[PDB]
Design a protein around this ligand. Structure first.
Ligand SMILES: Nc1nc2c(ncn2[C@@H]2O[C@H](COP(=O)(O)O)[C@@H](O)[C@H]2O)c(=O)[nH]1
Ligand SMILES: Nc1nc2c(ncn2[C@@H]2O[C@H](COP(=O)(O)O)[C@@H](O)[C@H]2O)c(=O)[nH]1
Ligand SMILES: Nc1nc2c(ncn2[C@@H]2O[C@H](COP(=O)(O)O)[C@@H](O)[C@H]2O)c(=O)[nH]1
Ligand SMILES: Nc1nc2c(ncn2[C@@H]2O[C@H](COP(=O)(O)O)[C@@H](O)[C@H]2O)c(=O)[nH]1
Ligand SMILES: Nc1nc2c(ncn2[C@@H]2O[C@H](COP(=O)(O)O)[C@@H](O)[C@H]2O)c(=O)[nH]1
Ligand SMILES: Nc1ncnc2c1ncn2[C@@H]1O[C@H](COP(=O)(O)O)[C@@H](O)[C@H]1O
Ligand SMILES: Nc1ncnc2c1ncn2[C@@H]1O[C@H](COP(=O)(O)O)[C@@H](O)[C@H]1O
Ligand SMILES: Nc1ncnc2c1ncn2[C@@H]1O[C@H](COP(=O)(O)O)[C@@H](O)[C@H]1O
Ligand SMILES: Nc1ncnc2c1ncn2[C@@H]1O[C@H](COP(=O)(O)O)[C@@H](O)[C@H]1O
Ligand SMILES: Nc1ncnc2c1ncn2[C@@H]1O[C@H](COP(=O)(O)O)[C@@H](O)[C@H]1O
Ligand SMILES: CC(C)(COP(=O)(O)O)[C@@H](O)C(=O)NCCC(=O)NCCS
Ligand SMILES: Nc1ccn([C@@H]2O[C@H](COP(=O)(O)O)[C@@H](O)[C@H]2O)c(=O)n1
Ligand SMILES: Nc1ccn([C@@H]2O[C@H](COP(=O)(O)O)[C@@H](O)[C@H]2O)c(=O)n1
Ligand SMILES: Nc1ccn([C@@H]2O[C@H](COP(=O)(O)O)[C@@H](O)[C@H]2O)c(=O)n1
Ligand SMILES: Nc1ccn([C@@H]2O[C@H](COP(=O)(O)O)[C@@H](O)[C@H]2O)c(=O)n1
Ligand SMILES: Nc1ccn([C@@H]2O[C@H](COP(=O)(O)O)[C@@H](O)[C@H]2O)c(=O)n1
Ligand SMILES: Nc1ccn([C@@H]2O[C@H](COP(=O)(O)O)[C@@H](O)[C@H]2O)c(=O)n1
Ligand SMILES: Nc1ccn([C@@H]2O[C@H](COP(=O)(O)O)[C@@H](O)[C@H]2O)c(=O)n1
Ligand SMILES: Nc1ccn([C@@H]2O[C@H](COP(=O)(O)O)[C@@H](O)[C@H]2O)c(=O)n1
Ligand SMILES: Nc1ccn([C@@H]2O[C@H](COP(=O)(O)O)[C@@H](O)[C@H]2O)c(=O)n1
Ligand SMILES: Nc1ccn([C@@H]2O[C@H](COP(=O)(O)O)[C@@H](O)[C@H]2O)c(=O)n1
Ligand SMILES: Nc1ccn([C@@H]2O[C@H](COP(=O)(O)O)[C@@H](O)[C@H]2O)c(=O)n1
Ligand SMILES: O=c1ccn([C@@H]2O[C@H](COP(=O)(O)O)[C@@H](O)[C@H]2O)c(=O)[nH]1
Ligand SMILES: O=c1ccn([C@@H]2O[C@H](COP(=O)(O)O)[C@@H](O)[C@H]2O)c(=O)[nH]1
Ligand SMILES: O=c1ccn([C@@H]2O[C@H](COP(=O)(O)O)[C@@H](O)[C@H]2O)c(=O)[nH]1
Ligand SMILES: O=c1ccn([C@@H]2O[C@H](COP(=O)(O)O)[C@@H](O)[C@H]2O)c(=O)[nH]1
Ligand SMILES: O=c1ccn([C@@H]2O[C@H](COP(=O)(O)O)[C@@H](O)[C@H]2O)c(=O)[nH]1
Ligand SMILES: O=c1ccn([C@@H]2O[C@H](COP(=O)(O)O)[C@@H](O)[C@H]2O)c(=O)[nH]1
Ligand SMILES: O=c1ccn([C@@H]2O[C@H](COP(=O)(O)O)[C@@H](O)[C@H]2O)c(=O)[nH]1
Ligand SMILES: [Mg+2]
Lengths: 111, 115, 103, 217, 69, 79, 87
């Protein structure tokens, strides 16, 4: 099953410079897990999202919907939607300007 | 719905969003085969003499039943590449955006509230 | 004034006087329209002249609750009257080419 | 006793066997969840599952401003101006994505449709989301609070000053002037309220509906 | 100057004590993100902002708006 | 449990720690002016200790370490 | 109006055997309480699948597995089934 534990097996395989997985409350409604990861270049991000779809296509999940990769024309942000987690790929410069880690951990106490 | 030159409001923490003086952005195009724009449709937007792409998030028009019918036509700003301009969104945003086709996972990571 | 003010914008032309009357050190709009001392924000300079000329406007502002009308100082009429005094010559003799005169 | 509006058939040339078949599916759904007595002035907290998320529930609180829709697809619309911004959700009553509906304050306002609260001040329509339900009394009259609102200036969404709407929930006098009181009274049309065949006399029909309700238990 | 001077010391130590059991999110970036939240923002500010910033981390201690796993 | 085992282990993880220096690192190092430390940076000294040795260090006794002689002497009787 | 028009490819979702109801998807030409002509579909994809249907007619005198009050489809919600949870 395509769950949270093999994300650590998959992201640390390609030497991700940053991993941030957040358990969102069940009250707040987007997903179950929120994954924010960074990269070295925009090339390293683009092949990284194109391999995390490679594991899902062979692991099965027959009845589940497919996967669309959003952001194929931009370089600073790449995001992939799934049923029980949503992964988000940025650059270390883009990490700070959006401050996306503190949004889902502090819903209304931030800048 | 949102045709050409409706008045909308930008719901963003942008420096371009808190406009003084003529504080009413005017759209110039909808990116559909109709003039009609619904929840999750690209539109253009003329702000301060600058034309900018935009994304409809909720309108004043009655649509389907269990979807919110917001009393202001509020619209989030994106550039051509697809990510939003701002850093935070404080207004409520409907959760009808996830299933619909488009770069909408960029928007839902910015919303503080999901009603 | 070689084009109509509509296609460019009255407030768009209004900020460009503040570029050319403050960075040229030609602060010549502060004896006819002296507001407090001098300002470089287009929001503030269209405020105080609208008080001095008595300008009122009724604008549909778009807040989240609905469409309400708020009486505001008339920012286009303040942007009009600030542009006419430039063309009459009651604001100072200015060169617009100092940006290309640098060097 | 309170008979809910959707069980009353609208006047029409529809065969009564259609509404008999409708009331069977109304009453089988009511076994699943309890539908309380909620009026047009009632405040409701509705929990719904939705297919947009991964299977969570959403709790939306609001004032039940308009309770039309006459059949199995009966609707009620709630209002909140939470975080300064108006939210307007039309809840279908018999849709199987609802889990439980409860009243926070069971009360009734003077008007049968509170659609004017769009043109009212937001102070008269905001509601505390985490507020506790009020303690109910078993057998007394429902509370009618004469809380006639004040409005924003004249360009409203609809012409509520006209007597065809028959709004009795506005303090009209301090926001509207006497010459355009008189001009709105030009549309008075006094013959409607004296009329007989535009009045749908529905007293006999509730006897068959209440016969159907208690025989289902 | 804050609500309590010792409460700043305790809220730093408790959030790292919640952070030693981190196993999926990287422990290396977690300690640096704790520091850059506090070295930049808790040196010199106004009066009421001191009470607000410490109460910000009390909500982050409970994890009722989201926990980092 | 040797006393000199405290001397070469607690100082070792401080030697890996890069904010302090060998230049002023005596046995009676002052922490405000002979080390250059902050209020929460004193906690960072403790969290350089608690991850490797301990796991029962309280809060109020972790304030008054103040010097490298006490961190050997106080935590010797902790065992 | 007042001409014979046909709508094509309308699914039956449900059947009430007691009052003889056909639950037909969408709208049918004609006003309420009007007489219609109910034929199996002409659409090529929807006209070959007729194996399980009772072929001459349906005969209630066969007395084998008497049909209930209401025959359903797979996707329909039962009135009496609880609230649907998508998780
Ligand atoms: N159009 C398009 N297809 C691409 C691009 N990059 C990769 N692909 C396609 O996507 C495939 C990888 O996805 P699979 O589902 O594993 C590649 O084999 C290639 O055909 C791209 O930039 N544009
Ligand atoms: N029955 C019916 N509903 C209609 C018709 N036109 C519009 N509607 C209703 O109004 C909604 C909005 O229509 P617009 O064309 O988007 C539709 O989804 C439907 O509910 C019509 O001709 N018949
Ligand atoms: N954009 C798009 N989506 C389609 C198309 N055909 C099918 N789909 C998607 O697949 C889903 C299932 O369709 P099947 O034909 O049952 C649809 O609801 C829609 O989301 C198509 O031509 N274009
Ligand atoms: N179901 C359906 N049939 C339509 C619709 N519009 C036209 N038709 C069919 O096409 C016929 C001819 O319409 P033209 O617009 O002349 C109609 O009588 C009707 O049978 C529509 O919106 N829905
Ligand atoms: N649901 C629906 N049916 C339509 C619509 N327009 C036409 N029809 C169908 O077409 C019929 C009219 O046939 P022609 O237009 O003569 C209607 O009775 C109805 O069955 C429409 O907008 N919605
Ligand atoms: N021929 C045309 N027809 C329709 N819309 C047009 C158009 N040319 C331009 N536009 C609109 O004007 C916008 C700005 O284009 P401009 O050439 O940069 C376009 O994105 C489109 O919305
Ligand atoms: N089957 C179809 N064939 C052609 N265009 C279609 C179509 N369905 C939708 N469209 C186009 O998309 C627009 C939006 O329709 P939607 O169903 O709201 C239509 O007005 C039309 O331009
Ligand atoms: N022929 C078609 N062309 C384009 N988009 C289509 C389509 N058929 C379905 N869709 C998409 O799928 C959505 C509905 O999902 P499905 O078809 O139930 C539509 O709103 C549209 O976005
Ligand atoms: N909310 C409603 N739902 C359905 N029919 C309605 C209605 N309000 C009015 N009608 C009907 O519509 C017709 C014209 O109403 P209008 O308000 O004049 C009348 O036959 C009336 O009974
Ligand atoms: N054309 C239409 N499109 C969508 N929903 C409709 C509709 N006509 C009726 N309804 C639904 O049915 C309810 C009223 O039932 P009926 O028309 O008496 C409406 O409030 C709405 O939920
Ligand atoms: C007060 C002090 C200078 C004490 O440092 P010393 O050196 O021991 C330092 O600890 C400090 O600045 N604490 C700030 C606490 C606070 O109120 N933070 C919130 C600011 S918004
Ligand atoms: N864009 C695409 C994607 C898949 N396909 C077909 O669908 C098959 C399954 O691809 P999925 O991405 O697993 C491919 O091997 C190819 O035959 C295609 O033709 N065009
Ligand atoms: N042009 C396409 C694109 C996708 N697909 C289907 O969608 C699946 C996922 O494709 P995405 O582009 O990742 C493919 O494996 C294939 O089954 C297709 O059949 N034809
Ligand atoms: N012809 C197509 C194109 C896309 N798709 C779906 O949309 C997804 C994204 O395709 P885009 O062209 O990037 C695919 O992976 C597939 O699931 C499809 O099913 N058929
Ligand atoms: N004698 C009648 C017949 C129908 N009606 C109802 O009125 C509707 C339309 O007329 P309004 O009441 O104006 C019809 O569809 C029917 O429901 C009525 O009020 N009196
Ligand atoms: N014929 C209809 C009936 C309702 N509706 C929609 O459904 C909502 C609920 O109406 P009900 O009849 O209570 C309306 O406010 C309108 O948005 C519609 O669009 N067309
Ligand atoms: N030869 C034919 C056959 C059918 N029809 C039309 O098609 C309708 C449906 O016919 P099917 O055979 O059920 C008829 O009621 C008639 O309107 C026709 O006009 N001429
Ligand atoms: N223009 C339309 C739209 C829908 N319909 C009918 O309504 C049904 C439901 O359509 P909705 O758009 O989901 C259709 O299957 C069709 O029978 C129609 O006849 N004409
Ligand atoms: N414009 C139209 C016309 C018909 N219809 C639907 O088609 C049915 C049959 O209408 P025909 O014109 O007989 C109507 O009862 C209505 O449900 C519609 O929804 N919209
Ligand atoms: N444009 C239309 C036409 C019919 N209808 C509805 O469809 C149903 C069937 O009407 P037909 O015209 O017989 C009625 O409930 C009618 O009110 C509708 O909602 N919108
Ligand atoms: N009345 C009709 C309509 C479509 N068709 C055919 O049925 C198929 C699908 O129907 P529509 O295009 O949805 C097509 O091959 C079309 O030509 C038919 O045979 N008779
Ligand atoms: N005018 C015509 C003539 C023949 N056909 C036939 O009917 C078939 C319907 O195919 P559907 O679109 O699946 C066509 O491929 C063609 O053979 C048609 O659709 N229209
Ligand atoms: O047949 C199609 C074509 C595109 N699409 C969607 O539209 C997206 C953009 O397609 P274009 O051809 O660039 C694609 O990635 C899919 O998500 C479909 O779902 N089906
Ligand atoms: O050069 C162009 C571009 C678009 N179009 C039309 O506009 C439609 C939408 O285009 P956009 O760029 O999304 C496209 O499908 C065509 O019908 C043209 O006719 N010519
Ligand atoms: O099924 C459809 C829907 C729309 N259209 C075209 O799109 C136009 C606008 O339709 P929309 O649904 O508003 C319509 O006039 C047709 O030209 C089709 O060709 N087929
Ligand atoms: O009762 C009628 C007669 C004709 N018509 C339409 O008008 C067209 C021309 O007929 P006339 O009335 O002669 C015919 O082809 C039909 O589309 C109707 O819709 N209804
Ligand atoms: O716009 C429409 C929609 C459906 N229909 C008819 O209704 C049938 C059922 O469609 P629905 O959307 O499931 C379809 O097969 C057509 O025969 C139309 O004629 N026009
Ligand atoms: O929007 C629609 C839907 C169906 N149809 C017609 O109805 C036929 C049957 O469609 P259904 O959805 O099975 C289809 O082949 C078309 O001839 C339309 O013309 N427009
Ligand atoms: O106008 C017509 C005539 C025949 N048909 C179809 O063609 C079938 C017989 O015609 P062929 O030539 O086999 C008939 O049963 C219908 O399915 C139409 O759909 N429309
Ligand atoms: Mg209006």
């Amino acid at each position: 099953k395509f769950d949270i534990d093999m994300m650590v097996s998959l992201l640390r395989q390609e030497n991700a410079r940053d991993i941030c997985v957040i358990q969102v409350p069940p009250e707040m409604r987007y997903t179950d897990y929120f994954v924010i990861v960074s990269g070295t270049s925009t090339r390293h991000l683009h092949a990284m999202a194109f391999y995390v779809v490679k594991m899902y296509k062979h692991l099965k999940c027959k009845r589940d919907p497919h996967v669309k990769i959003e952001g194929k024309d931009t370089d600073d942000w790449l995001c992939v939607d799934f049923g029980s987690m949503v992964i988000h790929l940025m650059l270390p410069e883009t990490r700070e300007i959006y401050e996306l880690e503190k949004l889902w951990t502090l819903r209304s106490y931030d800048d | 719905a949102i045709q050409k030159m409706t008045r909308v409001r930008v719901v963003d923490n942008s420096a371009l969003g808190n406009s003084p003086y003529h504080r009413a952005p005017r759209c110039i195009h909808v990116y559909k085969k109709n003039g009609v724009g619904k929840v999750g449709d690209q539109i253009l937007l003329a702000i301060k003499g600058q034309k900018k792409k935009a994304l409809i998030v909720g309108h004043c028009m009655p649509g389907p039943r269990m979807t919110p019918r917001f009393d202001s036509n509020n619209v989030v700003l994106i550039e051509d590449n697809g990510n939003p301009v701002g850093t935070r969104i404080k207004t409520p945003i409907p959760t009808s955006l996830r299933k619909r086709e488009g770069e909408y996972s960029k928007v839902l990571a910015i919303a503080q509230n999901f009603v | 004034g070689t084009v109509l003010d509509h296609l460019v914008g009255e407030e768009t032309m209004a900020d460009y006087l503040l570029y050319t009357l403050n960075k040229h050190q030609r602060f010549g709009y502060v004896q006819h329209y002296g507001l407090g001392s001098a300002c470089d924000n287009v929001e503030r300079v269209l405020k105080s002249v609208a008080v001095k000329l008595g300008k009122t406007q009724k604008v549909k502002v778009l807040t989240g609750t609905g469409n309400v009308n708020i009486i505001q100082p008339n920012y286009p009429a303040a942007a009009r009257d600030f542009l006419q005094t430039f063309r009459r010559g009651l604001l100072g003799s200015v060169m617009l080419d100092l940006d290309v005169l640098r060097g | 006793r309170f008979l809910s509006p959707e069980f009353i058939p609208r006047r029409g040339r529809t065969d009564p066997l259609k509404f008999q078949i409708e009331r069977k599916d109304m009453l089988e759904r009511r076994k699943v969840l309890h539908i309380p007595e909620f009026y047009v002035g009632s405040i409701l907290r509705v929990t719904t599952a939705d297919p947009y998320a991964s299977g969570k529930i959403s709790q939306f609180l609001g004032i039940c401003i308009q309770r039309s829709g006459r059949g199995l697809g009966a609707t009620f619309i709630l209002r909140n101006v939470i975080e300064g911004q108006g939210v307007e959700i039309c809840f279908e009553l018999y849709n199987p994505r609802v889990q439980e509906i409860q009243v926070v304050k069971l009360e009734k306002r003077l008007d049968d449709s509170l659609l004017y609260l769009r043109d009212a001040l937001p102070e008269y329509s905001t509601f505390d989301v985490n507020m506790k339900p009020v303690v109910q009394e078993p057998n007394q009259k429902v509370p009618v609070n004469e809380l006639k609102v004040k409005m924003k200036p004249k360009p409203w969404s609809k012409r509520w000053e006209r007597p065809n709407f028959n709004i009795k929930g506005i303090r009209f006098d301090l926001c509207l002037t006497e010459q355009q009181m008189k001009e709105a009274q030009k549309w008075n049309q006094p013959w409607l309220e004296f009329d007989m065949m535009r009045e749908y006399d529905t007293s006999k029909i509730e006897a068959a509906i209440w016969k159907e309700i208690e025989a289902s238990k | 100057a804050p609500w309590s001077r010792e409460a700043v010391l305790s809220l730093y130590r408790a959030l790292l004590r919640q952070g030693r059991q981190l196993r999926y999110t990287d422990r290396d970036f977690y300690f640096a993100s704790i520091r850059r939240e506090f070295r930049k923002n808790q040196k010199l500010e106004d009066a009421e902002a001191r009470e607000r910033q410490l109460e910000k981390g009390l909500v982050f201690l409970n994890g009722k708006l989201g926990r980092i796993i | 449990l040797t006393l000199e085992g405290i001397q070469d282990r607690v100082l070792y993880v401080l030697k890996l720690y890069d904010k302090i220096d060998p230049e002023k690192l005596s046995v009676n190092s002052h922490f405000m002016k002979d080390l250059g430390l902050d209020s929460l940076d004193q906690v960072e000294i403790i969290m350089a200790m608690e991850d490797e040795f301990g796991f029962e260090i309280p809060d109020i006794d972790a304030e008054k370490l103040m010097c490298p002689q006490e961190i050997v002497d106080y935590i010797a009787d902790k065992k | 109006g007042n001409i014979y028009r046909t709508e094509y490819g309308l699914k039956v979702w449900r059947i009430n055997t007691k009052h003889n109801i056909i639950y037909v998807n969408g709208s049918v030409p004609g006003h309420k309480n009007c007489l219609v002509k109910v034929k199996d579909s002409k659409l090529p994809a929807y006209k070959d699948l007729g194996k399980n249907l009772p072929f001459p007619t349906y005969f209630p005198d066969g007395d084998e597995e008497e049909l209930p009050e209401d025959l359903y489809d797979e996707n329909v919600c039962q009135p009496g089934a609880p609230s649907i949870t998508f998780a």
